[PDB]
Design a protein around this ligand. Structure first.
Ligand SMILES: O=C(c1ccco1)N1CCN(C(=O)C2CC2)CC1
Ligand SMILES: O=C(c1ccco1)N1CCN(C(=O)C2CC2)CC1
Ligand SMILES: [Cl-]
Ligand SMILES: [Mg+2]
Ligand SMILES: [Mg+2]
Ligand SMILES: [Mg+2]
Ligand SMILES: [Mg+2]
Lengths: 194, 194
């Protein structure tokens, strides 16, 4: 029933733009929305990937590998799944493995890859693939792994046991001003609810 | 170690603005980011999203979701019920109110997250994730009455919690919908648990 009628540029940065979206409502009435989009999406299935990296290690409980970074939009430190934008021509899987290695040092193995999922659909068109990757922590590749952070990337790795993820996150947020990512929180919640 | 030095308005609409953020990287080098922000926040967070567990005896427990046209996405999305928190509303009351408006269900608060970030590489947007149970055997939830305010057009989709990920993948496959990243993240962890 509903569809886009027109999209008029309001302001274009180097990385992000704002648009006035006109669309048809199901009553048959024209309405508008203020939409955010990135400037960087070309032919990729989505803007980015986030990685759910399950660290598996003999006689260890499975950990979820997370990263902590300063996020200028937020004005503070955030705890998230490893993530980055998909390079032109890169597959979501390759991007996930590459970002995981750059951000954490770990060399993972693909498990599964979501369809493109929307980050904040009342606000932006931005999308990701959520890529589950296992990390064989018994492999010597993954023994004492060096993050290879790109220019201006400053990332800390935090591995937390899957079996206590939510309480461990709640305890980190108790100790300091940091914000947990909604996707990480959502996944830690489901782990409790299951 | 990292922090915001200053913010420059680039463009301000009625609902969203774009800012150029100057911040200090951990080396002592000054860098910029194109930060997006809502103009509506006053509150704990911009919004709430509701994880609504519909519990009926002798049925599978379901997670109640909503399907809506999202103009920034150019299409239909499947999401947790959600909306912005009104001035002087608590995140709990916002949750029960949005849930009622969008689904017609009346629920009870189980738990409520701290403020969590929506897309921290892009925006300062935050929500409270509020887990809510719905006693689907109560008379008030028998023939649920959804009260859309002006311009909301919301279809309700309940899905069994025990097969949530497979049910969502099916809808994407069949209906050309975009699943929300938080919904998908939750659905993933229900499978990944134990
Ligand atoms: O443009 C926006 C907006 C919000 C975030 C980004 O853009 N709005 C939201 C407020 N309104 C509504 O809720 C629509 C009538 C349903 C009107 C349009
Ligand atoms: O301004 C933005 C941006 C992207 C989305 C919203 O704003 N960027 C992104 C890429 N940046 C880097 O990766 C710097 C090396 C740290 C430079 C500026
Ligand atoms: Cl529950
Ligand atoms: Mg990243
Ligand atoms: Mg990166
Ligand atoms: Mg809503
Ligand atoms: Mg509503």
């Amino acid at each position: 029933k509903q569809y886009i009628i027109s999209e008029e540029l309001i302001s274009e940065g180097k990385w992000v733009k704002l648009e006035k979206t006109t669309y048809m409502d199901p009553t048959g009435k024209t309405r508008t929305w203020e939409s955010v989009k990135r400037t960087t999406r070309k032919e990729q299935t989505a803007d980015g990937v986030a990685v759910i990296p399950v660290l598996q290690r003999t006689l260890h409980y499975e950990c979820i590998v997370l990263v902590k970074q300063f996020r200028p939009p937020m004005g503070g430190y955030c705890i998230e799944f490893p993530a980055g934008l998909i390079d032109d021509g890169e597959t979501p899987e390759a991007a996930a493995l590459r970002e995981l290695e750059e951000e954490t040092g770990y060399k993972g193995d693909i498990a599964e890859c979501s369809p493109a999922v929307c980050m904040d659909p009342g606000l932006s068109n931005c999308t990701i693939h959520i890529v589950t990757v296992t990390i064989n922590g018994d492999d010597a590749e993954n023994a004492r792994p060096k993050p290879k952070p790109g220019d201006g990337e400053f990332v800390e790795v935090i591995s937390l046991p899957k079996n206590d993820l939510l309480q461990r996150l709640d305890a980190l947020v108790a100790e300091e001003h940091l914000t947990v990512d909604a996707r990480v929180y959502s996944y830690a919640l489901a782990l409790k609810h299951a």
